Amino acid sequence: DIVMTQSHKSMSTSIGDRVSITCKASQDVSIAVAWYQQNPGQSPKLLIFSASYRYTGVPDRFTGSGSGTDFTITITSVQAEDLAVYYCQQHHSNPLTFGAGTKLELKRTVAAPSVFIFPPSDEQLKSGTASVVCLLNNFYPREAKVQWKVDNALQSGNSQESVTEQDSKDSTYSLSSTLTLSKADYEKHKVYACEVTHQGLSSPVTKSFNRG
Amino acid sequence: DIQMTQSPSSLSASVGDRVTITCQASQDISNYLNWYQQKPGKAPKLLIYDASNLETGVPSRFSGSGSGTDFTFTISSLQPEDIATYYCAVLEFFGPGTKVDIKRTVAAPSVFIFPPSDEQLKSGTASVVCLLNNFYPREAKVQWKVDNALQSGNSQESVTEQDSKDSTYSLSSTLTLSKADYEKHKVYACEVTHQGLSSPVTKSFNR
Amino acid sequence: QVQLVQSGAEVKKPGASVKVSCKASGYTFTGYYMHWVRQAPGQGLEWMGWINPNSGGTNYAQKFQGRVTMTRDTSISTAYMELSRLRSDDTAVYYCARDGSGDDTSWHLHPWGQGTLVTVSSASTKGPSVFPLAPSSKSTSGGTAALGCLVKDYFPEPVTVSWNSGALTSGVHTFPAVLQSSGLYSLSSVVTVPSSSLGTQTYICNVNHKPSNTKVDKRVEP
Amino acid sequence: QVQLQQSGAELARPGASVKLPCKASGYTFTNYGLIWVKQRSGQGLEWIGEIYPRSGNTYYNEKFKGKATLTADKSSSTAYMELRSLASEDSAVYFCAKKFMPTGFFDYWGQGTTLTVSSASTKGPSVFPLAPSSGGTAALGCLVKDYFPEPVTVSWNSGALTSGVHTFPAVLQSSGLYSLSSVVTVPSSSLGTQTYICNVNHKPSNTKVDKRVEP
Numbered sequence A: 001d002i003v004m005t006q007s008h009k010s011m012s013t014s015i016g017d018r019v020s021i022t023c024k025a026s027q028d029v030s031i032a033v034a035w036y037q038q039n040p041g042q043s044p045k046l047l048i049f050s051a052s053y054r055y056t057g058v059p060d061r062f063t064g065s066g067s068g069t070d071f072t073i074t075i076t077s078v079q080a081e082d083l084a085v086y087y088c089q090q091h092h093s094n095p096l097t098f099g100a101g102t103k104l105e106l107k108r109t110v111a112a113p114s115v116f117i118f119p120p121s122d123e124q125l126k127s128g129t130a131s132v133v134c135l136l137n138n139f140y141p142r143e144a145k146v147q148w149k150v151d152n153a154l155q156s157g158n159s160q161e162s163v164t165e166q167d168s169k170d171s172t173y174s175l176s177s178t179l180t181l182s183k184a185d186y187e188k189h190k191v192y193a194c195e196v197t198h199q200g201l202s203s204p205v206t207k208s209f210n211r212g
Numbered sequence B: 001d002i003q004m005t006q007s008p009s010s011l012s013a014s015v016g017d018r019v020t021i022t023c024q025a026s027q028d029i030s031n032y033l034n035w036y037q038q039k040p041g042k043a044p045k046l047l048i049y050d051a052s053n054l055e056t057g058v059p060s061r062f063s064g065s066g067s068g069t070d071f072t073f074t075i076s077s078l079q080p081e082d083i084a085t086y087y088c089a090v091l092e093f094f095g096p097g098t099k100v101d102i103k104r105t106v107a108a109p110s111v112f113i114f115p116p117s118d119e120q121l122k123s124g125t126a127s128v129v130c131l132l133n134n135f136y137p138r139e140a141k142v143q144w145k146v147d148n149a150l151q152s153g154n155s156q157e158s159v160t161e162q163d164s165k166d167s168t169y170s171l172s173s174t175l176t177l178s179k180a181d182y183e184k185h186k187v188y189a190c191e192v193t194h195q196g197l198s199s200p201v202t203k204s205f206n207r
Numbered sequence C: 001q002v003q004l005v006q007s008g009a010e011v012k013k014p015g016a017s018v019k020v021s022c023k024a025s026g027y028t029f030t031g032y033y034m035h036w037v038r039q040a041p042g043q044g045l046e047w048m049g050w051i052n053p054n055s056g057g058t059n060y061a062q063k064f065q066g067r068v069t070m071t072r073d074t075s076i077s078t079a080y081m082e083l084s085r086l087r088s089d090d091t092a093v094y095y096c097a098r099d100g101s102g103d104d105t106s107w108h109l110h111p112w113g114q115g116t117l118v119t120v121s122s123a124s125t126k127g128p129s130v131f132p133l134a135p136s137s138k139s140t141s142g143g144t145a146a147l148g149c150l151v152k153d154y155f156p157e158p159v160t161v162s163w164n165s166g167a168l169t170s171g172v173h174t175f176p177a178v179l180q181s182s183g184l185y186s187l188s189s190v191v192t193v194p195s196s197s198l199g200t201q202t203y204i205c206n207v208n209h210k211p212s213n214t215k216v217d218k219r220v221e222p
Numbered sequence D: 001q002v003q004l005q006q007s008g009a010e011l012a013r014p015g016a017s018v019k020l021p022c023k024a025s026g027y028t029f030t031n032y033g034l035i036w037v038k039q040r041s042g043q044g045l046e047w048i049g050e051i052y053p054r055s056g057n058t059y060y061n062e063k064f065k066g067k068a069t070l071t072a073d074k075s076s077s078t079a080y081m082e083l084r085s086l087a088s089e090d091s092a093v094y095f096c097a098k099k100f101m102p103t104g105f106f107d108y109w110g111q112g113t114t115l116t117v118s119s120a121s122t123k124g125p126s127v128f129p130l131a132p133s134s135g136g137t138a139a140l141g142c143l144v145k146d147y148f149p150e151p152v153t154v155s156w157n158s159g160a161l162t163s164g165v166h167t168f169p170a171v172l173q174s175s176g177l178y179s180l181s182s183v184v185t186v187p188s189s190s191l192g193t194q195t196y197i198c199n200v201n202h203k204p205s206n207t208k209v210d211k212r213v214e215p
């Protein structure tokens, strides 16, 4: 199929500055390209079509350019409303294809996460399951790794992860990882540790608790 | 791939008549037939699409129906300006066309004659024009008299299409002569015989 | 309004090529397929092909496949049709037409360009000599008299005739041209008027033969 | 007022089928193609196929041949997509969209219908506290675990506590049940003197739980 490649899943920019999102087509599509904007929970909105024409109702801040394979949408003077996801789409031929999207995000000074480990609740242990929660609070950029260790032994495939959207005020991110063990397995080991790696951390941070 | 036929090929109707023409398709095309109207000298105009849908901006006297292979197009009240050729079509295939004329009351021609211009005589040619204005029916005869001598082989004619307003025809005959031949005579006349005339009409000039 | 304006009439020698233009206005050019349909004089309609102005894709009648080329310039919303290796049977009026239908199978060709007459011939272009047709002077004092213009010896077709710069439309008859033995065309544009206006009002015909870029505003008076 | 009205969230069991409606109004239903678009986890736009109501013709993405079936009902101006042989990977938001112009692009979209495929029925959550550790700022929270379907609403002190709150997106466990975390940072001085109650409400099960988090 015609592959529409947005090489950047995410781009960092600032209010008022100028940002350009890229899309490359694997085959010549002439100008049969459109750009759509989508915010969380809403439907895609059309902004640019046939490569450089603005859909009705789109401020001059949005411009589009390209012909052939290389296409760009440029936002001059980024505003808050523009912090969203952007998809290219070719209409040269079937199957119709979209790009993967590039989310516009705000830049800010690096901030290391504040780590917190939480032992399983006694109320939960009285039920047969055990959940150990680690929390990385207000950090930037959002690339971060969490390694769970039990008795200094790494864990894999036993935890789930979840991250928030960029804070309106802080421009930071938070993450919540949950290690899920059985009551039997939890009561058989001693130390439980959360190791956090982050750009803003010289060395991985670890927060632990001894079961008891 | 798809053969289109239309009937009648031609027809003559009166102002106000309900005129229906037909179109047949070599194969089943559901209701995908469109009808275009083309007035002499102009481009075709879409009037009906998907067999029965009237194009926006087209008068309501035009209609259409049919599905499968056989279709019809209808003018509920023929208007003087509805003279045209009507083509059916589906995709790339066009029907041969139906020409609609109007039958009208007889109208006698307003005959006029024009001698050659002085500018044209400088060139060595003499063009004598004779005009028959807004007549009906279309048949008319024009005999040129160069000096009471019935001319031949030196006249060219041209007729206009039926007028969109009064459904008449106009004709224009041109007698072309050597200026050497044009000076040697003096009584140039255009005789006009038409049904609308009680007797033939002749307009002449001198010089 | 939604309209398509085509380039002017042209004459082309056999074996040469012709490129007809079509400028779209009043609608988003890139959004609608554009078709070309030709018409040999007196005959019916013949479809040549279409172009997708957005993707630039095209589809041609197999009759024209290796001989026609369709393109577009979206920056000026113009479509083009180029026919090569012209022969006498290519003489025809070539029409622009937009498909206003969004179905994958229906074609609703609306609107149509005004047409471009392409004449395939080895003869050269020649402007017309415009002569006056003066009233008989006899006339009927309380009646109507006739005056006209003779547009003579030109090639290729067409000429356009106006009267008083379009002010005079009633009673005008521009006759179809007639081909003379010499290969040149000739016609007549006349108009009926009241015998009273002959001495007061002035009537000037406005002949225009674009293939030679000739324009004659001839005044008719007895 | 061009609108594409789609149905509300739909739940369906594996192996079953669904028929998702798209009610069109405000334009000539027959003069514009309609497409369906899949999007999982607010992430990518996958083209499923297109239908032309006037012609009735359909064009599918090869990957959705045999899974999806598009139909159009000119009488109701409603498009339908039928998803057959439902599986877990068909859980997603499905958008409706109308072609801008005959040569492509799409100017009006349906709001989207969220489809969930799961072998589980309504189940309220169990809310377990996440107590602060042994001046500085402290972290506490609540763990809303083993509930279905989504969503859940979590507030702190009945809304009187918003600064520092972080309610994370839910995750789907292998058990087919969802689990979510809500946390807030507060001054260590506040622990003891200030009480902290997370307020969890799971409307799909009429479950309203308030849990006091204590050191």
Ligand SMILES: [Cl-]
Residues within 6 Å of the ligand: B044, B045, B046, C109, C110, C111, C112
């Ligand atoms: Cl039209």
Ligand SMILES: [Cl-]
Residues within 6 Å of the ligand: B160, B161, B162, B163, B164, C172, C173, C174
């Ligand atoms: Cl006329």
Ligand SMILES: [Cl-]
Residues within 6 Å of the ligand: A028, A029, A030, C055, C056, C057
């Ligand atoms: Cl192309």
Ligand SMILES: [Cl-]
Residues within 6 Å of the ligand: C087, C088
């Ligand atoms: Cl030849």
Ligand SMILES: [K+]
Residues within 6 Å of the ligand: A011, A012, A013, A018, A019, A020
């Ligand atoms: K940037």
Ligand SMILES: [K+]
Residues within 6 Å of the ligand: B028, B029, B032
């Ligand atoms: K067909």
Ligand SMILES: [K+]
Residues within 6 Å of the ligand: B182, B183, B184, B185, B186, B207
């Ligand atoms: K003489």
Ligand SMILES: [K+]
Residues within 6 Å of the ligand: C056, C070, C071, C072, C073
């Ligand atoms: K092109």
Ligand SMILES: [K+]
Residues within 6 Å of the ligand: C099, C101, C102, C103, C104, C105, C106, C107, C108, D102
């Ligand atoms: K179409």
